[PDB]
C-alpha cells in the first residue's frame, strides 16, 4: 500500500464506489496469475470475444493480465492473418477514420502501441491506411497514427518500398501546397518521422542504399523555395532538413559500412541553397555536416568531382564568412560578384564608404550579424571593458570609428586587449564560438581547419 | 493605439514580400523571354539556380536594412525598437530546438533496442510453444463443485448468524 500511491489507490477504491452510478478446459478469463497461466497452459483456451480483451490492490486485477492477453494469443495461436487481435485493431481503426467511433483518442493509443510491434500487422495498417484517400478523411489521425508506427517499422520487401513512399510523400507535399496553408505542415512532421525510420534502414546492413536514396529524394522537397523561402521561412522545413542532414552526419561517422560516393555528398543544388539562406542553426548544421563530410574527404582522391564540389563549398564559405575577398572570386554561391556591386545600387547604406565589405563577414551577414552583436556584448562583459562598441552591427567602419576618438587611450586599456584590427575582432568573435557554450560553435570550429591563422587562434 | 497600425504592417509586410518575390519571378523570366521571344522552358536546375540567386537577394536586402537600423542603433524609429525584440527572439529560441532534435534520436534508439529485445523474446516464445505438448466428461466433478459451493456458502452464512467464535475459510 505504498505511500506515494495512496492517493491513486484511494482514488481507484473511490472510483469503484463512484462509477456504480456516476470442465477439463480453462478459460483465459478465469486465470488469476502468471504462475497459474504457466501451470494450466495445456488446459487454457481463449474465449472468442475479441472486444473484451483489447480494451479495459491485493486481489487480482485482470487488467494486469489483459496486458499479456494480446501477446499470449499471438503465441498460443501462431501470429497470422487469422489471429483475432488483427481484426479488432483494424476494425476500430476503420471506425476511427470514419468518425463512427465515440472517442478515437481513446482507441488510437491502444492501436499505435500494439501496431508498433507485429511488423506484419504494422505493414497491413501501412498498406491499407498510408494513402492519400485516408489523408482526405482525417489528416490528424493519420499523421498521429502513421507517425507513431512508422519510426519502428521494417520493410520485409526492399523492392517498390521507396517508390511507394516517394509517391505517397509527394502527394502530401502537394496536399499542403494545394491548401497553401503553412499550418498544413503535415509534410514536415511526416518528413521528420520517416527520416527517424530511415535511421533503422541505414542501421540495417542491407536496404541501406534504399535509405540513402529516399533521404536525398526527400531532401529535394524540403529545399524547394515555396516550402522554405528565405523571406517566408517557416521553421518546420528547417528543423526537418537539419534532422535529415543530421542523419548523414551519423552515417558519415558510421562509415565502417561502405557507401557509394553518389548520395554521400548532399550535392551543390542543396548546399548553394542552404548557403543562400541565413538561418544560423541551418548554417550550423551545414558546417556540422561538412566536418562530418570532411571525415570522409581524405578517403577519396582530391581530383574527384565529389571532392571538387565540396572543396568549392568550404572555399566560398570561408571567403563569404571570414576571408572577405569575395569580389575577386569567380562567383559567390554560383552568382557573379558584378551583381553585388550592382545590387547595392538602390540599396541605401548609412556608411556607403564601405558598401561591399559589410556583407562579406559574419558581423554583417544578416542573422549572423545580430549574433555577432550578442557575441561582442558578452566579450565586452567578460573583458569588463569600460569602452563599448558604439554601433549595434559590427563591421570595419563601426569598429574603427570609435577607436580613432579613443585611440590615444585604447593603447593602454579600456577595450578588448585581444584585438587591434577588425580581423582580430572577427577572430575574437569566433574565439567565443570556439567552445561548447554556443549552439552555433560549429561554424567557427569547422572553418578553423582551413584558415591557418584561425586554427592557431583556436 | 499604435499597435493597430503595427499589426496592419505585420500583415502588409507578408503581403509586400510575397508580392516582391513573385515580382522577381516575373522580372527574371520576363527579361529571359525578352532575349528570346519564347524562352518559357527554363530548366529545373536553371530554375533552381535562379531561386538560389533570389534567396541570396533576400540575404542582401534584409542585410541592407539590418545595417540601416543597427549601424546607428539610435532607437529613433519606434519600429526599430520592435525589430530589436523581433531579432532577439529569433536567435534566443534556437537552443531548445537543437537540443530536443538531438535527444529524440537517442529516445528512438531506446525504442529500437526495446523492439529488438522483444522480437528475440517472441522468437523464443514461438519456438518453445511449438515444442510444447498440445492442449487437452467433467459431469461428476462439476456436481462435486456444486456440492462444495452449497456446503461452504451455507456454513459461511449460518456460522455468522450463529455467532460462531472463529469465522474461517470453509474449504
Amino acid at each position: 500500500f505504498p505511500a506515494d500511491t495512496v492517493q491513486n489507490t484511494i482514488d481507484m477504491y473511490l472510483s469503484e464506489i463512484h462509477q456504480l452510478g456516476a470442465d477439463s478446459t480453462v478459460s483465459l478469463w478465469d486465470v488469476t496469475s502468471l504462475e497459474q497461466l504457466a501451470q494450466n497452459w495445456p488446459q487454457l483456451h481463449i474465449p472468442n470475444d475479441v472486444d473484451y480483451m483489447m480494451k479495459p490492490r491485493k486481489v487480482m486485477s485482470r487488467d494486469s493480465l489483459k496486458h499479456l492477453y494480446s501477446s499470449i494469443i499471438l503465441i498460443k495461436n501462431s501470429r497470422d492473418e487469422s489471429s483475432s487481435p488483427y481484426e479488432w485493431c483494424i476494425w476500430q481503426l476503420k471506425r476511427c477514420f470514419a468518425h463512427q467511433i465515440e472517442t478515437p483518442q481513446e482507441v488510437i493509443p491502444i492501436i499505435i502501441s500494439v501496431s508498433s510491434m507485429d511488423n506484419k500487422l504494422s505493414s497491413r495498417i501501412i498498406q491499407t491506411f498510408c494513402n492519400l484517400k485516408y489523408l482526405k478523411l482525417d489528416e490528424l489521425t493519420l499523421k498521429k497514427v502513421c507517425g507513431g508506427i512508422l519510426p519502428l517499422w521494417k520493410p520485409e520487401l526492399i523492392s517498390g518500398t521507396r517508390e511507394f513512399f516517394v509517391k505517397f510523400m509527394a502527394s502530401i507535399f502537394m496536399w499542403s501546397t494545394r491548401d497553401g496553408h503553412d499550418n498544413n505542415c503535415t509534410f514536415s512532421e511526416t518528413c521528420f518521422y520517416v527520416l527517424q525510420m530511415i535511421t533503422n534502414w541505414v542501421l540495417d546492413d542491407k536496404l541501406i542504399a534504399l535509405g540513402l536514396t529516399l533521404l536525398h529524394d526527400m531532401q529535394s522537397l524540403l529545399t524547394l523555395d515555396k516550402i522554405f523561402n528565405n523571406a517566408t521561412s517557416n521553421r518546420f522545413s528547417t528543423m526537418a532538413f537539419i534532422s535529415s542532414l543530421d542523419i548523414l552526419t551519423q552515417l558519415s561517422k558510421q562509415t565502417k559500412s561502405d557507401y557509394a560516393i553518389q548520395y554521400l555528398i548532399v550535392g551543390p543544388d542543396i548546399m548553394n541553397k542552404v548557403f543562400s539562406s541565413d538561418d544560423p542553426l541551418l548554417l550550423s548544421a551545414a558546417c556540422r555536416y561538412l566536418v562530418a563530410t570532411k571525415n570522409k574527404l581524405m578517403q577519396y582522391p582530391s581530383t574527384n568531382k565529389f571532392v571538387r564540389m565540396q572543396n568549392q563549398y568550404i572555399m566560398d564559405l570561408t571567403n563569404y564568412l571570414y576571408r572577405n575577398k569575395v569580389l575577386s572570386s569567380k562567383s559567390l554561391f554560383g552568382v557573379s560578384p558584378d551583381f553585388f556591386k550592382q545590387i547595392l545600387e538602390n540599396l541605401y547604406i548609412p556608411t556607403a564608404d564601405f558598401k561591399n565589405a559589410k556583407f562579406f563577414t559574419i558581423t554583417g551577414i544578416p542573422a549572423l550579424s545580430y549574433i555577432c552583436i550578442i557575441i561582442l556584448r558578452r566579450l565586452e562583459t567578460a573583458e569588463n571593458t569600460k569602452i563599448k562598441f558604439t554601433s549595434g552591427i559590427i563591421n570595419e567602419e563601426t569598429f574603427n570609428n570609435f577607436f580613432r576618438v579613443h585611440h590615444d587611450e585604447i593603447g593602454q586599456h579600456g577595450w578588448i586587449k585581444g584585438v587591434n584590427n577588425i580581423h582580430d575582432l572577427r577572430v575574437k568573435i569566433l574565439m567565443h564560438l570556439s567552445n561548447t557554450a554556443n549552439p552555433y560553435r560549429d561554424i567557427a570550429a569547422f572553418l578553423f581547419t582551413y584558415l591557418k591563422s584561425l586554427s592557431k587562434y583556436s | 493605439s499604435s499597435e493597430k497600425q503595427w499589426e496592419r504592417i505585420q500583415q502588409l509586410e507578408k503581403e509586400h514580400v510575397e508580392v516582391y518575390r513573385e515580382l522577381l519571378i516575373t522580372l527574371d523570366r520576363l527579361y529571359l523571354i525578352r532575349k528570346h521571344n519564347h524562352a518559357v522552358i527554363l530548366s529545373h536546375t536553371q530554375q533552381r539556380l535562379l531561386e538560389i540567386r533570389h534567396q541570396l537577394q533576400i540575404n542582401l536586402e534584409k542585410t541592407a536594412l539590418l545595417i540601416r537600423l543597427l549601424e546607428k542603433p539610435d532607437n529613433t524609429n519606434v519600429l526599430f525598437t520592435k525589430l530589436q525584440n523581433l531579432l532577439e527572439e529569433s536567435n534566443s529560441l534556437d537552443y531548445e530546438l537543437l537540443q530536443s532534435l538531438g535527444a529524440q534520436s537517442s529516445l528512438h534508439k531506446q525504442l529500437i533496442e526495446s523492439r529488438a529485445e522483444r522480437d528475440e523474446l517472441m522468437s523464443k516464445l514461438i519456438e518453445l510453444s511449438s515444442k510444447f505438448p498440445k492442449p487437452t466428461t467433467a459431469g461428476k466433478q462439476v456436481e462435486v463443485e456444486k456440492e462444495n459451493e452449497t456446503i461452504q456458502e451455507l456454513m459461511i452464512a449460518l456460522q455468522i448468524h450463529s455467532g460462531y467464535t472463529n469465522i474461517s475459510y470453509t474449504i
Partner: peptide
C-alpha cells in the same frame, strides 16, 4: 531510380 527525380521535378515544375 531517376523516375523519382522526374516526379520530383514535376512537383518542382508545379511550384
Amino acid at each position: 531510380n531517376d523516375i523519382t527525380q522526374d516526379f520530383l521535378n514535376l512537383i518542382s515544375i508545379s511550384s
